[PDB]
Amino acid sequence: ATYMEESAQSAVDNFGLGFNLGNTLDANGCGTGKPVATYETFWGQPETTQDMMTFLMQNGFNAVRIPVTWYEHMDAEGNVDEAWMMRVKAIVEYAMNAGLYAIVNVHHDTAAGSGAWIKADTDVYAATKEKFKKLWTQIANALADYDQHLLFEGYNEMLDGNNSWDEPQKASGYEALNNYAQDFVDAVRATGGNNATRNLIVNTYAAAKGENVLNNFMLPTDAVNNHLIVQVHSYDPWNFFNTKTTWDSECHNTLTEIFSALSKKFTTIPYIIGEYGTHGESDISVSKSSPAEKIKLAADQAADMVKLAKDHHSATFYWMSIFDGSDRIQPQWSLPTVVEAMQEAYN
Numbered sequence: 001a002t003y004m005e006e007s008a009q010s011a012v013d014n015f016g017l018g019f020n021l022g023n024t025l026d027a028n029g030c031g032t033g034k035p036v037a038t039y040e041t042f043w044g045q046p047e048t049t050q051d052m053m054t055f056l057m058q059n060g061f062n063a064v065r066i067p068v069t070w071y072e073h074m075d076a077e078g079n080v081d082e083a084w085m086m087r088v089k090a091i092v093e094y095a096m097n098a099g100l101y102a103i104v105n106v107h108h109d110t111a112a113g114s115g116a117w118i119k120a121d122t123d124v125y126a127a128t129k130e131k132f133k134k135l136w137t138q139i140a141n142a143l144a145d146y147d148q149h150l151l152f153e154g155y156n157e158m159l160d161g162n163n164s165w166d167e168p169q170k171a172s173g174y175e176a177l178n179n180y181a182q183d184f185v186d187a188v189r190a191t192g193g194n195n196a197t198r199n200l201i202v203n204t205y206a207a208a209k210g211e212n213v214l215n216n217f218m219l220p221t222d223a224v225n226n227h228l229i230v231q232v233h234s235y236d237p238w239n240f241f242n243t244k245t246t247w248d249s250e251c252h253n254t255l256t257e258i259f260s261a262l263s264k265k266f267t268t269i270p271y272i273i274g275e276y277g278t279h280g281e282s283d284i285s286v287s288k289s290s291p292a293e294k295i296k297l298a299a300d301q302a303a304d305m306v307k308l309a310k311d312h313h314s315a316t317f318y319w320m321s322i323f324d325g326s327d328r329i330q331p332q333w334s335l336p337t338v339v340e341a342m343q344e345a346y347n
């Protein structure tokens, strides 16, 4: 056996520059029973290829987050379609083959979209906890043989039944989320093998980081040590892409405060910025057709995010924009100057 156990902090330190393969295996809404490719391409992304993962590794990235949405691939008894599990496995292998770290999660099974069923709510938790544990048991077993470069992330963006994006409206919501987190760690660990010591990722409420969300977050208990990572997301300052001209002191101060708050909260365990980007109101975001000034804005955000995370022994994963759509097939960067700013900041 070639597995080599690695601490959570070591993993996060080795992630380097990360990228989210977004709107891909997380895409959903076309209905059940469709060909696997129908899902993968439903939101405008090409079918993933080995070349894409190789391209990431060979151009200064060492980690990829692979969001997966599962509900359209589960039958009435919660069993995952074999064709779907094999495709998730195949894309994981692309990443493993390229020498990348990879994260597999449970994505639009949470939050505000139709089909979401995992929610920070007492009644929802009660009704879904068995399905959630069975889902993760299947994922853990399916991906059991991959080594320490593969991490599991329990859930993406858990909200209450009100879809409240800052905090649950009722405190009991936190207890539901914390229970899901524990069940996730428990189900994964119970499958044994590499999963006994695999590094696992748990997300805050809404992947947010306001003072109450951080205070009410509690890390699941884990029998092995230093194998848990906490994740938040950061599209900060909120809506800056539509309101700011330049990445100025206000922007920089916003990020530096965020990392200070995160490092103060999480002292013995590493945390990551699992998603970041320009995405703001109405999910408006940068593209190669954006004005040069707006592209520079994106570059400056990314450079700061990357540097600050390095300073704070964290790590970051870009949400989509830098490597998107038809550019994935070439393969080439969508936003070469943004990537260049990230590379310079990290190195």
Ligand SMILES: *CC(=O)N[C@@H]1O[C@H](CO)[C@@H](O[C@@H]2O[C@H](CO[C@H]3OC[C@@H](O)[C@H](O)[C@H]3O)[C@@H](O[C@@H]3O[C@H](CO[C@H]4OC[C@@H](O)[C@H](O)[C@H]4O)[C@@H](O[C@@H]4O[C@H](CO[C@H]5OC[C@@H](O)[C@H](O)[C@H]5O)[C@@H](O)[C@H](O)[C@H]4O)[C@H](O)[C@H]3O)[C@H](O)[C@H]2O)[C@H](O)[C@H]1O
Pocket: 022, 023, 028, 029, 030, 042, 043, 044, 108, 110, 111, 112, 113, 156, 157, 206, 207, 233, 234, 275, 279, 283, 319
């Ligand atoms: C807290 C945090 O950090 N969250 C993270 O935020 C990221 C940035 O927002 C987010 O990524 C975005 O995810 C959304 C999906 O969001 C939905 O599901 C989760 C809910 O909580 C949320 O409220 C919902 O909005 C991505 O949106 C999808 O974009 C698809 C592609 O759009 C792109 O290309 C087409 C162009 O028109 C768009 O302008 C361009 O953005 C789009 O695909 C189209 O789908 C329809 C079918 O739509 C039906 O089924 C899907 C349902 O979502 C939809 O409501 C329903 O009508 C097809 O017919 C078209 O051919 C497709 O093009 C999706 O509909 C749309 O939802 C967004 O792009 C992405 O940045 C992280 O996931 C999150 O963790």
Ligand SMILES: CC(=O)N[C@@H]1O[C@H](CO)[C@@H](O[C@@H]2O[C@H](CO[C@H]3OC[C@@H](O)[C@H](O)[C@H]3O)[C@@H](O[C@@H]3O[C@H](CO[C@H]4OC[C@@H](O)[C@H](O)[C@H]4O)[C@@H](O[C@@H]4O[C@H](CO[C@H]5OC[C@@H](O)[C@H](O)[C@H]5O)[C@@H](O)[C@H](O)[C@H]4O)[C@H](O)[C@H]3O)[C@H](O)[C@H]2O)[C@H](O)[C@H]1O
Pocket: 165, 206, 207, 208, 209, 210, 232, 233, 234, 235, 236, 237, 238, 254
């Ligand atoms: C003394 C004084 O006057 N103080 C001022 O008080 C103001 C009122 O509280 C305050 O303005 C609020 O600021 C907060 C955040 O402020 C700081 O911290 C985060 C930085 O990003 C920001 O630049 C800083 O200034 C704002 O919070 C944002 O709210 C968003 C939604 O709010 C809007 O819509 C709802 C409505 O009730 C509000 O009035 C309206 O403003 C929220 O949106 C959701 O974001 C997620 C994605 O979230 C990810 O990326 C953003 C990260 O911040 C987050 O941690 C991460 O998970 C999307 O998927 C959802 O679709 C969005 O709805 C933002 O997350 C949240 O940050 C608040 O809006 C604003 O009123 C002054 O700052 C303060 O000086």
Ligand SMILES: [Ca+2]
Pocket: 263, 266, 267, 268, 269, 270, 312, 313
């Ligand atoms: Ca620390």
